[PDB]
């Protein structure tokens, strides 16, 4: 059993997102598939089951027209069409593998969720993939580093000395800004005898914008 898929791309509120996981190694005519999301700091919620045999899928009480389910037998993969994403949708998406089969409303107490693997992530977003316009950060043993801003979405990778330095490189967690931006911080430790003599640069790569910014930090004048 496997559930290998691709990561979900960030979508604006009032739009549509698609999450689908590959099914192989078994026939897709007996297992009803479930969709569920991992809400942070609390429990999980359910909306309905998907049956690939007959047109008998139902809906939950709190999810009437939020989700629309379409089936396919040639590729044996369920397809996603979400509508009107909101701020409570900030969760990762996992396709729940359920054993057995059940249609009526007194046979679902016997089954259990079987397989979880390589889930995707769909969350609503006001801020959108923007090109970074980052500037070098002046330094203050001694410490120095560069900060990333005006970028979307998470995460980004900061490498020092063209990847030849890996000691002390920790990715500090970002914060949920009011304008929707983030800030990943990476710092390195140098002796105080060398602060403005040796050239230090950091490389930040941005995936959806295909931009590479090489900035050199300098002391404040």
């Amino acid at each position: 059993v496997q559930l290998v898929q691709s990561g979900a791309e960030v979508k604006k509120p009032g739009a549509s997102v698609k999450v689908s996981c590959k099914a192989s190694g078994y026939i897709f005519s007996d297992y009803n598939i479930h969709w569920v999301r991992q809400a942070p700091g609390q429990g999980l919620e359910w909306m309905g089951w998907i049956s690939p045999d007959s047109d008998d899928t139902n809906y939950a009480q709190s999810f009437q027209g939020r989700v629309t389910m379409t089936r396919d037998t040639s590729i044996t993969t369920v397809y996603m069409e979400l509508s009107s994403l909101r701020s409570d949708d900030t969760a990762v998406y996992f396709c729940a593998r359920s054993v057995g089969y059940c249609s009526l409303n007194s046979c679902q107490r016997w089954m259990w969720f079987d397989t979880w693997g390589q889930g995707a992530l769909v969350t609503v977003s006001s801020a959108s993939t923007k090109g970074p316009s980052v500037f070098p950060l002046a330094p203050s043993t001694a410490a120095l580093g560069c900060l990333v801003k005006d970028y979307f979405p998470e995460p980004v990778t900061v490498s020092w000395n063209s990847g030849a330095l890996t000691s002390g490189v920790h990715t500090f967690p970002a914060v949920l800004q009011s304008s929707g931006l983030y800030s990943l911080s990476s710092v390195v430790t140098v002796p105080s005898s060398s602060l403005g003599t040796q050239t230090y640069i950091c490389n930040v790569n941005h995936k959806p914008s295909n931009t590479k910014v090489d900035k050199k930090v300098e002391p404040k004048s």
Partner: protein
């Protein structure tokens, strides 16, 4: 109704602990209770099904059972190399769907405190060139975490959208945290002394860095 579950748990290693999941009349007993466990940065996995049959793939180490209102998941001993939240799930006839519990943290049981070190990073002239000014200070080499970082201009605190990031776990047995603050260049040069302080539950240090060099 919504299934509720202990937020966390305190159990020393080498001795058995259990997790309780209080429910209702139509959710527990008349319906089977399933226990989900998920690794950090990975996919979840079922621990016990139908409260008496163990899944294949795990040795005879855990135990789960139900007794009336609450269902008990006996954890015979605890290893410090694996700390995994446990989820509580059941089924209700009135709700006609799956409802899930809050989840419980498990922790081992004390170490002495460390000496925190804080640094301040004023922006360069390039950041001020775009008619903006932001300030960042970082705290590291402190154990344990649960720290709060606030800015201070040595005369009066400023609250222009002060934020503090959550502490994170590093690979060298230490915690780290950072704080961010963005202002205007006019108010940036109004004060010639900026600093941020940390609360290490008994230790407080001030990093006085002038915005000159």
């Amino acid at each position: 109704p919504v299934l509720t579950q202990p937020p966390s748990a305190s159990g020393p290693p080498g001795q058995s602990v259990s997790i309780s999941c209080s429910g209702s009349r139509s959710n527990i007993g008349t319906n089977f209770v399933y226990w989900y466990q998920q690794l950090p940065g990975a996919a979840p996995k079922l621990l016990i099904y139908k409260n008496d049959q163990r899944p294949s793939g795990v040795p005879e180490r855990f135990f789960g059972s139900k007794s009336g209102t609450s269902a008990s998941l006996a954890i015979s001993g605890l290893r410090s190399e694996d700390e995994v939240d446990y989820y509580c799930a059941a089924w209700d006839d009135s709700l006609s769907g799956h409802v899930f519990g809050a989840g419980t943290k498990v922790t081992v049981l004390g170490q002495p405190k460390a000496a925190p070190s804080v640094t301040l990073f004023p922006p360069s002239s390039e950041e001020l060139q775009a008619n903006k000014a932001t300030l960042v200070c970082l705290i590291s080499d402190f154990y344990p975490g649960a720290v709060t970082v606030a800015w201070k201009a040595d005369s009066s605190p400023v609250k222009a959208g002060v934020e503090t990031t959550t502490p994170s776990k590093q690979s060298n047995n230490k915690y780290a945290a950072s704080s961010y603050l963005s202002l205007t260049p006019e108010q940036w040069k109004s004060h010639r002394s900026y600093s941020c302080q940390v609360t290490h539950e008994g230790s407080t240090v001030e990093k006085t860095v002038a915005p000159t060099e």
